């Protein structure tokens, strides 16, 4: 029945990414002093069944000027590498056990931006043309900030797999010891996935609407359901790579219970920001990475290398 363990995953998650869109504007509602979608629910909890159905009724135009062969294979992705990445992710028991799999995320973190470059180019001119070009450029310069500061800690835990990374955070919430890094693990995923303070990719201010501009109701649910299938995953990751829970070979169930009451707090962070801060004006946006974020990330790497060796600490792995 291994095929019914899968399809029990893909389906029950599409409800979260659906019902996030509701808690989008309730939480961001009371920052403003008001209430959130209310009239339709009664509580509102019934809103997203009505919204999923307005789009696919609503007619899906294509530009007369487009290349239809690319205008499909691209979105036929924004929903794969979002739903594949979930596969080897322990909670506690991952569906797959990949030996070195931690590295496998970067494989699928790196291969999504090659679905932006298609779509914005697939269609047409300068609002999605050079406007989907220069959100490529920022999306690849926030990896080098990443793979390093992912690679740092992994000196402090011994291997590339995720079954060890529950063992080492036992009674030490891995955020003490590298708290300088942890910050930069946060501003990255918020800068890379195109969210609030570095917002530019999806346009509001700097342009009209980035990269979404052409898709009518028909395809544009996918992206608007793809872009929220990354955001609740990196944030359902960070908390396996920092704030660890305590496995329990007996009541596995109490592992996940206490696990979603963390990863679900953590997420409610990209909403708790977006009410707050303004945007960066694309110069300042990269111009603050090389100069500023990076020099440290190298420097710390020269540090977490020696700290095990200089304490006879060297973590028990191959």
């Amino acid at each position: 029945m291994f095929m019914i363990n899968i399809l029990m995953l893909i389906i029950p998650i599409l409800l979260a990414v659906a019902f996030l869109t509701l808690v989008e504007r309730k939480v961001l509602g009371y920052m403003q002093l008001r209430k959130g979608p209310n009239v339709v629910g009664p509580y509102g909890l019934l809103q997203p069944i009505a919204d999923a159905i307005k789009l696919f009724i609503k007619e899906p135009l294509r530009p007369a000027t487009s290349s239809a062969s690319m205008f499909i294979l691209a979105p036929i992705m924004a929903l794969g590498l979002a739903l594949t990445m979930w596969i080897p992710l322990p909670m506690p028991y991952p569906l797959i056990n990949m030996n070195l799999g931690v590295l496998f995320m970067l494989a699928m973190s790196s291969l999504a931006v090659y679905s932006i470059l298609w779509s914005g180019w697939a269609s047409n001119s300068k609002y999605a043309l050079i406007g989907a070009l220069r959100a490529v450029a920022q999306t690849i310069s926030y990896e080098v900030t990443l793979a390093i500061i992912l690679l740092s800690v992994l000196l402090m835990s011994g291997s590339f797999t995720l079954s060890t990374l529950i063992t080492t955070q036992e009674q030490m919430w891995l955020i003490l010891p590298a708290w300088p890094l942890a910050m930069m693990w946060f501003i990255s995923t918020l800068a890379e996935t195109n969210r609030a303070p570095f917002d530019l990719t999806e346009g509001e201010s700097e342009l009209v609407s980035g990269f979404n501009v052409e898709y009518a109701a028909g395809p544009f649910a996918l992206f608007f359901m793809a872009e929220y299938a990354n955001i609740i995953m990196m944030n359902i990751f960070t908390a396996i790579l920092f704030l660890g829970t305590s496995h329990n070979p007996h009541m596995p169930e109490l592992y996940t219970i206490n696990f979603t009451i963390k990863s679900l707090l953590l997420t409610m962070s990209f909403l708790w920001i977006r009410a707050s801060y303004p945007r960066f004006r694309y110069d300042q946006l990269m111009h603050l990475l090389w100069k500023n974020f990076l020099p440290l990330t190298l420097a710390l790497c020269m540090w977490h290398v020696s700290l095990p060796i200089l304490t006879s600490g060297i973590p028990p792995q191959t």
Partner: protein, 67 residues
Amino acid sequence: KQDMPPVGGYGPIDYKRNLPRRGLSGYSMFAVGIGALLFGYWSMMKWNRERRRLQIEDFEARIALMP
């Protein structure tokens, strides 16, 4: 002969500007901060120095049998 202004008495309420409250300033931070980071590592160097002590124990059974 019903008009607005009261007989006497008012505020005012000021227009002035203040809220600069801190908050562990001026090197008080960098003091607690570097203090936590250490107790992080001291919490390592022991778990990680214990876990190796089990590591050898595990490779022991392998060599024990396998003649």
